[PDB]
Amino acid sequence: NWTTNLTQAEQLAQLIKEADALVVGIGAGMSAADGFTYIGPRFETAFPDFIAKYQFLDMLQASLFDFEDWQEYWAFQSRFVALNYLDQPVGQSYLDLKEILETKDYHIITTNADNAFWVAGYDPHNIFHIQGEYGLWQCSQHCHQQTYKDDTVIRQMIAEQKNMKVPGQLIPHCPECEAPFEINKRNEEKGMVEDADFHAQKARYEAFLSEHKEGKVLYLEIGVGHTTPQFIKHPFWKRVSENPNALFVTLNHKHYRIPLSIRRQSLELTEHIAQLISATKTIYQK
């Protein structure tokens, strides 16, 4: 039973049923599987002006670009926040996953910063947004550990911008140091503003892990790649190595080489995440 000839969905369903607890790591693949993609027509349709000017290949690259000024930065980011946070509809795979998780003891860690868990109605106390959220702002100088939000201003920036610039007076500023706000995002050089809410999520996640150091714990990694493996992928590998009774299951249509220590505790399921989660739900429910 607890081991790594069945379909992928059958195998996953059985493992979930058997597990004492689930630690679920969710990356960009899960949102891309529901159509919330960062390259191709979705990106091209939303940012024809920015693409024509800078020859951006994809939306992740664009979102990290050092724009000429803050007027251009906010012209891009306001539209980016609308597409991926304010107006992004619920994804069916997030609903399917939620139905499965209802009967399990679980916690989610995610590197995603979109709205996907909120529009799907997950309990915020069960989710750790380790890379922040696009709907939040931070001081560009990180002068104090507090995040801010104002969706009304985001809408005004979309409405009022022209020729890829927001009007000067709409750029929001840090009330402590007067530097411009930027999106709450993590950066290798500067890090990320990590406020009281962030630390509360982190503590909740860490408490869950402290409770499940032993037993049949399923570390379920969904749509996590090589862009930032230090957040979910590597820590999960280490957890599984540390607990001989744990399993590592990754839902990814690409194969990432698993370390020697956990070769016997690993399963890789390659089917398209959306279809896989859907078929697993159907089997699990019965």
Ligand SMILES: NC(=O)c1ccc[n+]([C@@H]2O[C@H](COP(=O)([O-])OP(=O)(O)OC[C@H]3O[C@@H](n4cnc5c(N)ncnc54)[C@H](O)[C@@H]3O)[C@@H](O)[C@H]2O)c1
């Ligand atoms: N939705 C978001 O919020 C978003 C989107 C892009 C990037 N980011 C940021 O950039 C980094 C991205 O890293 P990452 O590891 O999350 O993503 P990644 O792009 O590095 O890896 C995504 C993985 O999912 C797989 N995948 C994609 N579609 C799939 C499908 N239909 N079925 C099965 N597998 C599929 C890919 O093969 C890939 O291995 C994160 O740190 C994050 O903060 C966030």
Ligand SMILES: [Zn+2]
């Ligand atoms: Zn400041």
